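Cont'd.
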Amino acid sequence: VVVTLSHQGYVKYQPLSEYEAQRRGGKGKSAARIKEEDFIDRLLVANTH
DNA sequence: ACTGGAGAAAGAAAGTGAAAGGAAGATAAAACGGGATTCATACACCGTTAAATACCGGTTTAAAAATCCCGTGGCGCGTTTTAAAAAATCTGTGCGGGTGATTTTAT
């Protein structure tokens, strides 16, 4: 899974099989919904156990 | 006149019914956040080419690395406190036969 954390503190993880590889130079798809004033600071990849 | 019992007055202490109010609860309206559709529209993938960049050979030189002396504060040791977690000890409760008790209405 992949773990994301926001500045004010919000945790969540998603299955890794949802995002598919592509070629460099793209824009990508949104991974989470941000609030009015917040931003993502960390990103982690790890196993459930 | 005097005595001792008895009833009535008077006074002081305790129990009482009623008391704002305030923290401590409780209950609704509201604002919120997370899923099912619906596409148009912007994004992903495939051929072409000018241009921008990586790479090699040889200097150099100024800057950073290496070395030596020393004087301290930042870790290390030993011994106390102090919360935190764990083990030990109490407290209720229901199963089924027995003893004894309570309340409200109409005519």
